[PDB]
Structure 1
Amino acid sequence: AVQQKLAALEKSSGGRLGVALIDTADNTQVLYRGDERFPMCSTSKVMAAAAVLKQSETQKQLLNQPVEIKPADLVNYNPIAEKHVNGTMTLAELSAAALQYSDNTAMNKLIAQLGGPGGVTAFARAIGDETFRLDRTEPTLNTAIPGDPRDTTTPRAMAQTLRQLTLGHALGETQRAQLVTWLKGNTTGAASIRAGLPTSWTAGDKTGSGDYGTTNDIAVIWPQGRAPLVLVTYFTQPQQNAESRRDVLASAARIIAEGL
């Protein structure tokens, strides 16, 4: 029923839809193209911010370290960083900017802190994610070209990783709590996964988008009276200039929630 429903949604959408749910009540999963690769776009900002949180476990002042923002550092979406050009932002500020505002300049500083995209990938491998790969910086990591393995993961892998980071033991308890608080404070998510969930429920999420109408969201969800869920919804379309479809992610999440 749920599989058939997600297939129906996909066919009507004209794109390719990827879904992974983990229900932590009983370790049940629901996968739809769970092992196909999709461009992550800004959902990758979670892995970068989490990597810096991991570093902060052994450098308890790391999040207070200032980082210079120069004019030439600004890229294509800098709602927070543009306010600080010719000044500085701390790594905590850059983390919150990247997660909660989806600031691309902030993400670049997180990547640089980790020694480049490969350091983010290395963190993913260290926590048992063999699938995630970050290959580029912002903004080009969002080109989302069909078939391109760069800056991709699978829904199954990303759901597992988001669970380990937010509900498991990938991070220390303080760092886990900080990540959760950041995600729950997201500003960009009301039209995506969370639009398809009951309004009683609480959640944190990280959205992404790019070329090929790519429209993504990953979420940790606390349903009324139930153990938490982790839900990944990835969507991408066959034409480079396709419009975003946050509604399709909301629809997928509604199918999932009604199936619980």
Structure 2
Amino acid sequence: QTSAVQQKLAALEKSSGGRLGVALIDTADNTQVLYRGDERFPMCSTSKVMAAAAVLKQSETQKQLLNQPVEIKPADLVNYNPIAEKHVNGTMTLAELSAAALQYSDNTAMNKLIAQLGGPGGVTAFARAIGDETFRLDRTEPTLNTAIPGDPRDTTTPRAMAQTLRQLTLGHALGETQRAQLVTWLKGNTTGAASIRAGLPTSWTVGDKTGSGDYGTTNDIAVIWPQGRAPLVLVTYFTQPQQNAESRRDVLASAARIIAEGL
């Protein structure tokens, strides 16, 4: 069937000119609302959640791992590295790299997480270990953001990412202290106020990870603690037909508003 919420999301998508993917999980009753929920979208920086979580999982058996220094060299800098560039010729710990990757979306930091996991396939392997058969990471930063229509590299579906985000942040894919650390990082994101949370009541608490790339790709994945109800998990992915298209964070906000109005 097609619900009123799904029809509104389709109208939003039609006005936007692009392709919108939405997946909500309401943990009050485990119900789901999906729009293009099984179509693939380029993850861009939203893939950093899986990489940081995979390192958190490694840290469960290595109490000192997150304090291990990682050397940052001039050649490690890529296209967006506001934190890592302050540490060139120095070191950052895996905790610092995770925080920078998640909260500032530093791309050099993401590459250090990927390298710690043995390459993009190590991120995919972690996804499989936690029951996500859909996620794939194939490249490092910055090429993982090419976002070419029809290209399966570095993609997932809204349904799969919402399920994984739930398991990581509210479920038991990670140990208790690691889950809390991931939640703390997401709640401290600096980049999210124009995306999902712009469409939600201001009294609700949000932790999220945004992303963007070529083809005007504009993404956000969020855990939401609304006023007076159990948490929600919401993924909004958006991509456009031309390579140089502008970001449309407003579309993600609009999708979130439609979702919230349908609760």
Compute the TM-score of the two structures, normalised by the length of structure 2: 0.99
After superposition, the C-alpha distances for 1:3-49 in whole angstroms (9 at most, x for unaligned) are 10000000000000000000000011000000000000000000000
CA distance in 2, matches of 1:243, 1:69: 32
**1:229 match:** 232
SS of equivalent residue, structure 1 residue 18: strand
After superposition, the C-alpha distances for 1:39-84 in whole angstroms (9 at most, x for unaligned) are 0000000000000000000001000000000000000000100000
After superposition, the C-alpha distances for 1:134-160 in whole angstroms (9 at most, x for unaligned) are 000000000000000000000000000
SS of equivalent residue, structure 1 residue 218: strand
Distance apart, 1:205 and its partner CA = 0.1
CA distance in 2, matches of 1:23, 1:73: 40
**2:106 match:** 103
Distance apart, 1:244 and its partner CA = 0.1
Where does structure 2 lack aligned partners over 5 or more consecutive residues? none
2:254 pairs with 1:245 = no
Where does structure 1 lack aligned partners over 5 or more consecutive residues? none
**2:81 match:** 78
After superposition, the C-alpha distances for 1:188-220 in whole angstroms (9 at most, x for unaligned) are 000000000000000100000000000000000
CA distance in 1, matches of 2:34, 2:77: 38
Distance apart, 1:231 and its partner CA = 0.1
RMSD: 0.2
SS of equivalent residue, structure 2 residue 183: helix
Distance apart, 1:254 and its partner CA = 0.3
After superposition, the C-alpha distances for 1:68-121 in whole angstroms (9 at most, x for unaligned) are 000000000001000000000000000000000000000000000000000000
The number of residues matched between the two structures is 260
SS of equivalent residue, structure 2 residue 214: coil
CA distance in 2, matches of 1:253, 1:219: 10
From 155, 164, 184, give the equivalent of 2:167.
Answer: 164
Q: Following superposition, which runs of at least 4 residues in structure 1 exceed 2 angstroms of deviation?
A: none
CA distance in 2, matches of 1:259, 1:211: 31
CA distance in 1, matches of 2:81, 2:48: 14
Compute the TM-score of the two structures, normalised by the length of structure 1: 1.00
